[PDB]
Write a protein that binds this ligand. Structure first.
Ligand SMILES: OC[C@H]1O[C@H](O[C@H]2[C@H](O)[C@@H](O)[C@H](OCCCCCC3CCCCC3)O[C@@H]2CO)[C@H](O)[C@@H](O)[C@@H]1O
Ligand SMILES: OC[C@H]1O[C@H](O[C@H]2[C@H](O)[C@@H](O)[C@H](OCCCCCC3CCCCC3)O[C@@H]2CO)[C@H](O)[C@@H](O)[C@@H]1O
Ligand SMILES: OC[C@H]1O[C@H](O[C@H]2[C@H](O)[C@@H](O)[C@H](OCCCCCC3CCCCC3)O[C@@H]2CO)[C@H](O)[C@@H](O)[C@@H]1O
Ligand SMILES: [Cu+2]
Lengths: 101, 241, 227, 241, 101
């Protein structure tokens, strides 16, 4: 029952989602020098109104990979982060537009 | 109305904590991606000074490297008038390369840093970002930017490597200092024939070989840019399934 | 011309041309000349030049201003491509017969498949006369003594002009009538069969059956004049 | 109603000035296209008599050349019951080839026209056009036309080249006159090994080699025809974006 | 304001359009022995009711080329002329059908 939450709470959670998306970005960096990729996608669908009508495409690319059809594909998959950024801000933009007029 | 915040000031503190967390994220995730892509396509010329030639390096490195910029520009510029698209990428690459050449190539296997220093992509990343911010046109950025990205690659690197292109009469044979570095610092698992540098043709004229390659790289770079802009737009998509 | 543009080390490290002899350096249309000499296949042949397993002894001239009446390596006629081998020294002769008046910088040369043109030294040779003098006689194994500079040329011009005009026919059988806007209207309006009439319908069968007939017979008539 | 014309007669003068301008246009544009396509795919066998063999030429030339006819038929026949589809193309090619062999190959580089005369495609272009006009069926034109296009190609050319297939004992070696032409009229930039003519196999029987190739060309030609009909339908499309 | 022109004027212009499409056909022929490819497409969109709802696909092929994704593609691009023919006549057919009954 978390598609009706106090706007202050929803935002507190988009804050937690980015703690996951940040830790994930570290794992991805130590990768080129998989756990959190679920810990985050879960959260965004578990506990966030914006991601409730069923899994983001580009959020998937960021976690699946070439497993949608070499390892350069795992590389190109990182650009999926633009889709998650585009969603999150569009969501945050709507929650704080007011507010910043 | 109802508010997530309790004061206009809070709404500005939050909207700028997010700026950091997202900056941090899109910096490191695109690092990892861009660096992996670049390591497997252009990476081999990028490790060693005696692979940085005039035919292949001049061709491969622009073409493979313009990709992710064109992807990241595609979203950041048109969704947010963000104009450090190419530069976030090239910053991320070089940071990733440099940590790897210093603490590993030199760090743990003792290769002289002046043997394993990276290519320099940042001049094109600025001329690209700016050409897009001015003009605000994907096409002019593709044509004028693509040519810019290729034609600038060797100039942006010649002041660094040129020292290593003075010749040497070593044990009877002419070698450049770059060649000497390759001969000297033993790459047990990377023997000489693996190296894809220019070797001459009977259908070819010698220098100029670098400018002719740079232009070819420019043209292919615009094609790669069109492709990788649309790929980036695709990548920046909020559609649900 | 053309070899000053090639990499210097290529030309030094590839094929060495020496002891060349040019039997003339002015010649009249139909007068033959002879370039002969030796060449060495340098055993340190460049990487990016395929070893000459498949090479061809050409001459460099702008068009057949000469014709190559003969060419030999090792006293064997070499009209096809040859295998040369790194390390070895070969002798050669080419028999040029002049065709087109002018001042020609004649190069003896060696095409190497997977390699490029390996260009030997050229000497100016001057042809005098009128090219209309040029005659290229051949005695066939059925003999018959032909001139290969014009043989069968009336048959090509014949048969090509026929089939072309046969084609222009078909196109003017129809462009007699109106072609585009009226046929368009006619088709859109449900009336497309109105546009191929039964005269139309096998005027068509004429051209078809005709073309097949004119093929099968003149086919059979060719395996007679040349059995 | 209101009229673009001021007399029924004017409406017939205009609707037939357009016939000329369009005829002219679709003739020359498709010339340029068809000729370029044919030059890069089949063009090499088409330049020289000592490339017109029984294996490859018999295969390549029908397959590559049936394309544009099937494209132009697709639009002209079904949109206008126009039945000179294949022939407009083959007319355009030969005109373009012939101007190029006479004024250039022979014209400016002195190759004997009987060395550089083109292939003859026009028999199949008539049997194709007619087989389509009768029957009015893309499929029967593909199957019966495709086989027609291939099986007719060598017969339609053998009366022209056969003179040049009488053998000759030249300096000790058997050569056909076509071979003699190639040996004689020096192609500086087209040496012998480039030429892809039949050479024999240990798995092969000699003549018949031409009929067997002609049929194979017929079968592939129907596949090329299906493909290139749909490609032509696509090409004849009035959709806006 | 040229989607409401006297039928005699519209036709006078489809006449000019084919003067461009003819000159272009010559350039294409001297090509195999780019200016007008704009001079014409422009006209058809500038000054002709039929081409007003935004650029013909196959008219584009005739001017772009392989730049929609060797040079055989520039060759296959000429077949785009069938699309422009199909449009022009369908337009002329409607303007003169009457008239030719
Ligand atoms: O800063 C004051 C804010 O406090 C609350 O939100 C906090 C949350 O309670 C707070 O828990 C959270 O903190 C973000 C810290 C980010 C973790 C950083 C890194 C940890 C290690 C490496 C990766 C991530 O985000 C907000 C502040 O950034 C309120 O919800 C906000 O409205 C209020 O403005
Ligand atoms: O002479 C009397 C006839 O003339 C007029 O029609 C002419 C037309 O006015 C006349 O212009 C037309 O010419 C046909 C050939 C013009 C294009 C020739 C080819 C160019 C090369 C390749 C194919 C087409 O042929 C028609 C009949 O021959 C009348 O309109 C006809 O009704 C009448 O039957
Ligand atoms: O022929 C009489 C007609 O005059 C007017 O249209 C003219 C136009 O005023 C006239 O300017 C125009 O002329 C077409 C000439 C075609 C140019 C030919 C080539 C020039 C050089 C090489 C390429 C193209 O087309 C029409 C005639 O074909 C009227 O609009 C018509 O309704 C009337 O029927
Ligand atoms: Cu010379």
């Amino acid at each position: 029952k978390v598609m009706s939450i106090t706007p202050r709470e929803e935002l507190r959670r988009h804050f937690t989602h980015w703690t996951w998306l940040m830790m994930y970005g570290i794992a991805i960096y130590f990768g080129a020098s998989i756990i959190t990729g679920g810990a985050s996608f879960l959260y965004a669908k578990t506990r966030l109104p914006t991601y409730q009508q069923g899994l983001s495409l580009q959020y998937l690319v960021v976690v699946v990979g070439p497993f949608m059809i070499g390892f350069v594909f795992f590389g190109w998959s990182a650009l999926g982060v633009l889709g998650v950024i585009n969603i999150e801000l569009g969501a945050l933009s709507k929650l704080l537009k007011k507010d910043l007029a | 109305s109802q508010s997530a915040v309790r004061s206009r000031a809070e709404a500005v503190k939050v909207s700028r904590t997010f700026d950091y967390m997202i900056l941090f994220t899109v910096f490191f995730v695109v690092l990892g991606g861009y660096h992996i892509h670049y390591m497997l396509t252009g990476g081999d010329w990028d490790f060693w000074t005696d692979w940085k030639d005039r035919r292949l390096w001049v061709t491969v490195a622009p073409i493979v490297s313009i990709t992710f910029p064109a992807a990241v520009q595609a979203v950041l510029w048109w969704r947010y008038r963000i104009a450090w698209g190419a530069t976030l990428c090239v910053l991320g690459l070089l940071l990733g390369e440099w940590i790897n050449r210093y603490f590993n190539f030199w760090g743990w296997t003792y290769f002289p840093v002046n043997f394993v220093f990276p290519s320099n992509l940042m001049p094109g990343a600025i001329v690209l970002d700016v050409i897009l911010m001015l003009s605000n046109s994907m096409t002019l950025t593709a044509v004028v930017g693509g040519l810019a990205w290729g034609l600038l690659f060797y100039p942006g690197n010649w002041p660094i490597i040129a020292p290593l292109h003075v010749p040497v009469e070593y044990n009877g044979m002419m070698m450049t200092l770059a060649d000497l570095q390759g001969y000297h610092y033993v790459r047990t698992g990377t023997p000489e024939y693996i190296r894809m540098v220019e070797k001459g043709t009977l259908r070819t004229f010698g220098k100029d070989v670098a400018p002719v390659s740079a232009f070819f790289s420019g043209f292919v770079s615009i094609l790669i840019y069109f492709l990788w802009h649309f790929f980036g737009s695709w990548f920046g998509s909020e559609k649900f399934v | 011309h053309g070899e000053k543009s090639q990499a210097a080390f290529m030309r030094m490290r590839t094929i060495h041309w020496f002891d060349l002899n040019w039997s003339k350096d002015q010649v009249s249309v139909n007068e033959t000349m002879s370039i002969s000499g030796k060449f060495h296949v340098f055993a340190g042949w460049p990487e990016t030049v395929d070893k000459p397993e498949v090479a061809f002894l050409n001459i460099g001239i702008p068009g057949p201003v000469f014709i190559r009446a003969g060419s030999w390596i090792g006293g064997q006629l070499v009209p096809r491509s040859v295998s040369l081998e790194l390390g070895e020294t070969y002798e050669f002769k080419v028999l040029l017969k002049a065709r087109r008046p002018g001042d020609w910088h004649v190069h003896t040369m060696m095409n190497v498949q997977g390699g490029g043109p390996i260009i030997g030294p050229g000497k100016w040779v001057t042809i005098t006369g009128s090219m209309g003098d040029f005659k290229n006689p051949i005695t066939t194994l059925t003999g018959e003594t032909i001139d290969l500079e014009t043989y069968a040329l009336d048959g090509v011009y014949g048969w090509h002009l026929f089939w072309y005009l046969l084609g222009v026919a078909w196109m003017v059988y129809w462009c007699r009538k109106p072609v585009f806007i009226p046929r368009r209207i006619a088709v859109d309006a449900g009336k497309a069969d109105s546009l191929i009439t039964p005269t139309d319908k096998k005027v068509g069968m004429a051209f078809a059956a005709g073309t097949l007939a004119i093929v099968a017979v003149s086919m059979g008539q060719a395996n007679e004049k040349y059995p």
